[PDB]
Amino acid sequence: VLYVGSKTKEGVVHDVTTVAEWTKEQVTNVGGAVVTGVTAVAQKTVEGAGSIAAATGFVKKD
Amino acid sequence: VLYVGSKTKEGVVHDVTTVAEWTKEQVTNVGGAVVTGVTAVAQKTVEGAGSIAAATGFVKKD
Amino acid sequence: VLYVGSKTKEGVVHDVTTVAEWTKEQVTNVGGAVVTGVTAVAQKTVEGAGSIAAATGFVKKD
Amino acid sequence: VLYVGSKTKEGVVHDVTTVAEWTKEQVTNVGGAVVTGVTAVAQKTVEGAGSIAAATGFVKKD
Amino acid sequence: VLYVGSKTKEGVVHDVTTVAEWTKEQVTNVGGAVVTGVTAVAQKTVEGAGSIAAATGFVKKD
Amino acid sequence: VLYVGSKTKEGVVHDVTTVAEWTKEQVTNVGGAVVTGVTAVAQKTVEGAGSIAAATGFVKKD
Numbered sequence: 444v445l446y447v448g449s450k451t452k453e454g455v456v457h458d459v460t461t462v463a464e465w466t467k468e469q470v471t472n473v474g475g476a477v478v479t480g481v482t483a484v485a486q487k488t489v490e491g492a493g494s495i496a497a498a499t500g501f502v503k504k505d
Numbered sequence: 506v507l508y509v510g511s512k513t514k515e516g517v518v519h520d521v522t523t524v525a526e527w528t529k530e531q532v533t534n535v536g537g538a539v540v541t542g543v544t545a546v547a548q549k550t551v552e553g554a555g556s557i558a559a560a561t562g563f564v565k566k567d
Numbered sequence: 568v569l570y571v572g573s574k575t576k577e578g579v580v581h582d583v584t585t586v587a588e589w590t591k592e593q594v595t596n597v598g599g600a601v602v603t604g605v606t607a608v609a610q611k612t613v614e615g616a617g618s619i620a621a622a623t624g625f626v627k628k629d
Numbered sequence: 630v631l632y633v634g635s636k637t638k639e640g641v642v643h644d645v646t647t648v649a650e651w652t653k654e655q656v657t658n659v660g661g662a663v664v665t666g667v668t669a670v671a672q673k674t675v676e677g678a679g680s681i682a683a684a685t686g687f688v689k690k691d
Numbered sequence: 692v693l694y695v696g697s698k699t700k701e702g703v704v705h706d707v708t709t710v711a712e713w714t715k716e717q718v719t720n721v722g723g724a725v726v727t728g729v730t731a732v733a734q735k736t737v738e739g740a741g742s743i744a745a746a747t748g749f750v751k752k753d
Numbered sequence: 754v755l756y757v758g759s760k761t762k763e764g765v766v767h768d769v770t771t772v773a774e775w776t777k778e779q780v781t782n783v784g785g786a787v788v789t790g791v792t793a794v795a796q797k798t799v800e801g802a803g804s805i806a807a808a809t810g811f812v813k814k815d
Contacts, residue, residue: 444506444507445506445507445508446507446508446509446511447508447509447510447511448509448510448511448712448713448775449508449511449512450511450512450513450514451512451513451514451515452514453513453514453515453516454515454516454517455514455516455517455518455519456517456518456519456521457517457518457519457520457521458520458522459520459521459522460522461522461523461524461543462524462526463524463525463526463528464526464527465526465527465528466525466527466528466529466530467529467530468528468529468530468531469531469532470530470531470532470533470539471533472532472533472534472535472537472539473535473536473537474535474536474537474564474599475537475564476537476538476539476540476562476563476564476624477537477538477539477540477562478539478540478561478562479539479540479541480540480541480542480543480544481521481523481543481544482540482543482544482561483518483521483543483544483545483546484544484546484559484561485516485517485518485546485547485548486516486546486547486548486549486551486558486559487515487516487548487549487550487577487578488549488550488551488552489551489552489556489558490551490552490553491551491552491553491554491555491556491616492554492555493554493555493556494551494554494555494556494557494558495556495557495558495560496551496556496557496558496559497546497558497559497560498557498559498560498561498562498563499540499544499560499561499562500561500562501560501562501563501564502563502564502566503563503564503565503566503567504564504566504567505567506568506569507568507569507570508569508570508571508573509570509571509572509573510571510572510573510774510775511570511573511574512573512574512575512576513574513575513576513577514576515575515576515577515578516577516578516579517576517578517579517580517581518579518580518581518583519579519580519581519582519583520582520584521582521583521584522584523584523585523586523605524586524588525586525587525588525590526588526589527588527589527590528587528589528590528591528592529591529592530590530591530592530593531593531594532592532593532594532595532601533595534594534595534596534597534599534601535597535598535599536597536598536599536626537599537626538599538600538601538602538624538625538626539599539600539601539602539624540601540602540623540624541601541602541603542602542603542604542605542606543583543585543605543606544602544605544606544623545580545583545605545606545607545608546606546608546621546623547578547579547580547608547609547610548578548608548609548610548611548613548620548621549577549578549610549611549612550611550612550613550614551613551614551618551620552613552614552615553613553614553615553616553617553618554616554617555616555617555618556613556616556617556618556619556620557618557619557620557622558613558618558619558620558621559608559620559621559622560619560621560622560623560624560625561602561606561622561623561624562623562624563622563624563625563626564625564626564628565625565626565627565628565629566626566628566629567629588634589634630692630693631692631693631694632693632694632695632697633694633695633696633697634695634696634697635694635697635698636697636698636699636700637698637699637700637701638700639699639700639701639702640701640702640703641700641702641703641704641705642703642704642705642707643703643704643705643706643707644706644708645706645707645708646708647708647709647710647729648710648712649710649711649712649714650712650713651712651713651714652711652713652714652715652716653715653716654714654715654716654717655717655718656716656717656718656719656725657719658718658719658720658721658723658725659721659722659723660721660722660723660750660785661723661750662723662724662725662726662748662749662750662810663723663724663725663726663748664725664726664747664748665725665726665727666726666727666728666729666730667707667709667729667730668726668729668730668747669704669707669729669730669731669732670730670732670745670747671702671703671704671732671733671734672702672732672733672734672735672737672744672745673701673702673734673735673736673763673764674735674736674737674738675737675738675742675744676737676738676739677737677738677739677740677741677742677802678740678741679740679741679742680737680740680741680742680743680744681742681743681744681746682737682742682743682744682745683732683744683745683746684743684745684746684747684748684749685726685730685746685747685748686747686748687746687748687749687750688749688750688752689749689750689751689752689753690750690752690753691753692754692755693754693755693756694755694756694757694759695756695757695758695759696757696758696759697756697759697760698759698760698761698762699760699761699762699763700762701761701762701763701764702763702764702765703762703764703765703766703767704765704766704767704769705765705766705767705768705769706768706770707768707769707770708770709770709771709772709791710772710774711772711773711774711776712774712775713774713775713776714773714775714776714777714778715777715778716776716777716778716779717779717780718778718779718780718781718787719781720780720781720782720783720785720787721783721784721785722783722784722785722812723785723812724785724786724787724788724810724811724812725785725786725787725788725810726787726788726809726810727787727788727789728788728789728790728791728792729769729771729791729792730788730791730792730809731766731769731791731792731793731794732792732794732807732809733764733765733766733794733795733796734764734794734795734796734797734799734806734807735763735764735796735797735798736797736798736799736800737799737800737804737806738799738800738801739799739800739801739802739803739804740802740803741802741803741804742799742802742803742804742805742806743804743805743806743808744799744804744805744806744807745794745806745807745808746805746807746808746809746810746811747788747792747808747809747810748809748810749808749810749811749812750811750812750814751811751812751813751814751815752812752814752815753815
């Protein structure tokens with residue numbers, strides 16, 4: 444293995460653009476997740492049993 | 506392995522752009538997560554059983 | 568392994584841009600997480616059982 | 630005339646993005662203009678006879 | 692005329708982004724202009740006869 | 754005229770970003786202008802006959 448002037452992009456997130464304008468937003472909740480923003484998870488490796496990698500809006504009610 | 510003038514980007518997040526303008530936002534809650542912003546997790550390695558890597562808006566009610 | 572004029576970016580977050588303008592935001596809460604800002608976690612390694620790496624908006628009610 | 634939370638953009642230039650990569654470029658010249666970069670003129674008012682407002686790559690050989 | 696929380700942008704230039712990477716560039720010249728960079732002129736008013744406002748790469752050989 | 758919490762930007766230049774990386778650049782010249790950098794002129798008023806406001810890479814060989 445050998446490079447020159449190279450580039451590598453394993454596991455990234457880029458150029459996420461959100462624009463809200465005149466936004467009215469009621470939200471109620473009782474006991475459960477609610478998500479409204481912009482989530483950005485970026486991982487390279489995840490290992491192991493029973494794992495939960497990069498959850499968003501989760502409820503685990505065993 | 507050997508490089509020259511190189512670049513590597515394992516596990517990153519970049520150029521996240523949020524724009525809110527005239528935003529009205531009520532939020533109530535009882536006992537459960539609520540997320541509205543902009544989350545940015547960036548990990549390289551995660552190992553081990555039972556793990557929960559990079560959760561956002563989570564409820565674990567065993 | 569040997570480099571020249573090189574660059575490595577394992578596990579980073581950069582160029583997060585938030586813009587709020589005329590933002591009205593009520594928030595109530597009872598007993599549960601609420602998140603509204605901009606979170607920026609950046610880790611290289613995480614190991615071990617039962618771990619919870621980089622949580623944001625979490626509730627663990629065993 | 631009266632505003633609120635307003636915005637005006639008379640005569641601007643913004644978000645000019647140039648990207649060159651592995652560019653070989655010979656250029657000769659004798660006695661005449663040559664332009665290769667990125668020009669950005671932004672004017673509001675220009676008045677008067679015979680004027681030459683915002684020239685780029687000009688030759689006036691009277 | 693009267694404002695509140697306002698903004699005005701008469702005659703500006705902003706967010707000019709240039710990126711060169713592995714650029715080889717020969718240039719010869721004899722007696723005439725040559726331009727290669729990034730020019731940024733930003734004027735509000737220019738008046739008067741015979742004027743030459745914001746020239747770039749000009750030759751006036753009367 | 755009267756403001757509150759206001760902003761005015763007559764005649765500006767801002768956020769000019771240049772990035773060169775591994776740049777080889779020969780340049781010869783005889784008797785004529787040559788420009789390679791990043792010029793940033795920002796004027797409010799210019800008046801008068803025969804004027805030359807904000808020239809860059811000019812040759813006036815009368």
